[PDB]
Amino acid sequence: VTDPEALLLLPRLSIQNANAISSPLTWGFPSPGAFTGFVHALQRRVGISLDIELDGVGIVCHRFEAQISQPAGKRTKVFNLTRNPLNRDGSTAAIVEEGRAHLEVSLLLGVHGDGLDDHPAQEIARQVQEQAGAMRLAGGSILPWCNERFPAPNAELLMLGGSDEQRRKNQRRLTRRLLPGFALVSREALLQQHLETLRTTLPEATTLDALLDLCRINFEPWQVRDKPGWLVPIPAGYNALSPLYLPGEVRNARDRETPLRFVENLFGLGEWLSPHRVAALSDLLWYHHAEPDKGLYRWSTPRFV
């Protein structure tokens, strides 16, 4: 929740065969929890040796192509699958449906540690950029740069050092390389007040969500209502439905050192706003905070406006 000292920009990042579905009720862009977990894994790989911290992300989505098809005059979509290898016999028995997507994302990470205190500026960015090219960001591999016009522009932009007009010039210089993207930010307060708006009959949050992202057509007693923005439903963290357990208690855990919980997704609201329409870039960083007393394990973006 701490404001960072620096916004280390990860560049144009083509990632292929991602997870499109990412939630039991959405199918579009992958979850932002994947991005916060990706930054925490990158921290566990490079930041302990670099003596820094890495907390937030800026999810911009320069381009996005799903592996879908619109089957033969229908208003829906279906998912392109992949043929799996055979069983002990030649059955092709099980076909579980999971989607894929190719997205060119570019993250901006909030640094906390000894960035300029004990280390240089370009070398830390070079190390983290050549470290993030040997891992996967959403369920699919991070494709490297082999095409022409070799960028490598890991801008390790300092934020708290400099005058105010120079700082605003640095923000509007970093926003120049976010040129065709679209930042994703949570709008929990917007969903709350939109729930209080239509609380006349029954104020269910899952009904205010499922009647806002659509196009609600309603004539004159002949129009559609004015689109307030690019509102999407996103997974906004998990919610436990079973108490805490011991490490070696629950059968077939991923590891027997950390406790287990049986959880369930929470569906929040999100917007794809242009990066020019934010004051500072550090306003749109995704952090995941947890309250282990109750069951809420929520990722969100504080200071989103």
Partner: protein, 424 residues
């Protein structure tokens, strides 16, 4: 008393269905079994059906088709911060999809009629007013009926996951992790699926289609959901969990959450005379839809001002952002920008969508190759703002039109200051 005065017809439904498949010796044996277990022994059949399969409210079978683990149906209630919505508060319409080990569908369909207006569907766990006299037998039959009716919410007890069941790691602030194993919210998924079905096609859906098409007009909360994908569970044989019925063949469909430009690519203003020579064009398909939306309800009223304070400037901001996004998308994947046949106006007015430096540049190439400012861009933006909104000679009688004009002038000045730094 919903055990003999009310459950008699429910028990005799089975003894009437056992008369349809009537045989000489096997039919008499089936009728004898139905008479032994349906005259007073309904508690024993209810105990067998309760022992047969488990009751799930969120089952983790749908995440891997060959994953045999624990699927607990606990309450997902999360009363915390006011920004989260999930399966935590259903209350009504919380259909418990019992799909653990369903080999006989008549297990859960034994006492599904005495709860609609009776006190036995809630007395099927504790406080047995008719729990001892419903069977009408001794303590053995009533005890078997009670132990079977408790098994509709009796979990396995020992928690268990699988190696194919999506166990992730959540990091705490300065502590050890918590491993989270999400399960598939079957009751919530079928609640939202019933919402989508009864909003997409049905009875009031077709009537609302008629109220949209013809002269008859009834505006209400009917909508069309675009771009929703289909994810099928089970495939050819959907027996993962129940509620995958005959037209619900794993057919859980997913709400659209795609990116802002999650469609394909398209443009019409390339480096040419018909594309870039047009010094004031200002067009796009998505920007055209946004302009039609912003120009449809293009008034400034007094009772509509409480929403038109933001719904009018929001459209102009979206139009400016769409123009900036089109200008950024045009000059990124088209390196051709130089002298050529039909590229005269693509050097002065094309200061925004202009290419990089050339191969035969001169010494003072900061004016004849790429001027360091959007010199023709500001007048073009002013003309586009004047043409997109038909301002009249009485459009400043109050501050409603003049405020939009001042906002358009400020947005044009901001876009000019942004585009001035483009050539550097």
């Amino acid at each position: 008393q919903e055990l003999r005065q009310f459950i008699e017809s429910f028990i005799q439904e089975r003894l009437q269905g056992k008369l349809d498949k009537l045989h000489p010796d096997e039919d008499d044996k089936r009728q004898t079994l139905l008479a032994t277990h349906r005259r007073e022994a309904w508690l024993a059949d209810a105990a067998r059906r309760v022992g047969q399969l488990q009751l799930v409210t969120h089952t983790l079978k749908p995440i891997h088709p060959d994953a045999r683990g624990s699927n607990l149906h606990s309450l997902p209630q999360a009363p915390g911060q006011p920004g989260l919505a999930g399966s935590h508060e259903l209350g009504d319409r919380l259909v418990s999809d019992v799909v653990g080990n369903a080999a006989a569908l008549d297990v859960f369909k034994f006492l599904s009629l005495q709860y609609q207006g009776k006190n036995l569907l809630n007395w099927l766990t504790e406080d047995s007013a008719e729990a001892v006299q419903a069977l009408s037998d001794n303590a053995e039959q009533a005890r078997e009926w009670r132990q079977a009716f408790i098994g509709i919410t009796a979990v396995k007890g020992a928690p268990a996951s699988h190696s194919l069941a999506k166990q992730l790691y959540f990091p705490l602030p300065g502590s050890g992790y918590h491993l989270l194993a999400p399960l598939f919210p079957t009751s919530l998924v079928h609640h939202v699926h019933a919402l989508l079905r009864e909003a997409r096609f049905g009875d009031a859906a077709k009537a609302a289609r008629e109220a949209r098409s013809r002269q008859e007009s009834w505006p209400h909360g009917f909508s069309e959901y675009p771009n929703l994908a289909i994810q099928k569970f089970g495939g050819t044989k959907p027996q993962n969990i129940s509620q995958l019925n005959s037209e619900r063949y794993g057919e859980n469909w997913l709400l659209p959450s795609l990116p802002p430009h999650w469609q394909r690519q398209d443009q019409r203003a390339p480096i040419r005379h018909s594309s870039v020579f047009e010094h004031d064009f200002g067009r796009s398909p998505e920007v055209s839809r946004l302009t039609r939306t912003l120009q449809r309800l293009l008034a400034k009223t007094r009772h509509n001002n409480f929403t038109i304070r933001r719904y009018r400037a929001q459209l102009v901001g979206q139009i400016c952002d769409e123009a900036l996004q089109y200008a950024a998308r045009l000059r990124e994947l088209e390196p051709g920008w130089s002298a050529t046949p039909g590229c005269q106006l693509h050097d002065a007015e094309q200061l925004w969508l202009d290419p990089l430096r050339a191969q035969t540049d001169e010494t003072f190439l900061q004016r004849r190759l790429r001027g360091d400012w959007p010199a023709e861009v500001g007048n073009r933006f002013a003309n586009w703002l004047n043409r997109a909104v038909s301002s009249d000679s009485q459009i400043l009688g109050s501050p409603e039109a003049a405020q939009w004009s001042q906002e358009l002038s400020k947005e044009l000045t901001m876009f000019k200051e942004i585009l001035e730094d483009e050539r550097d």
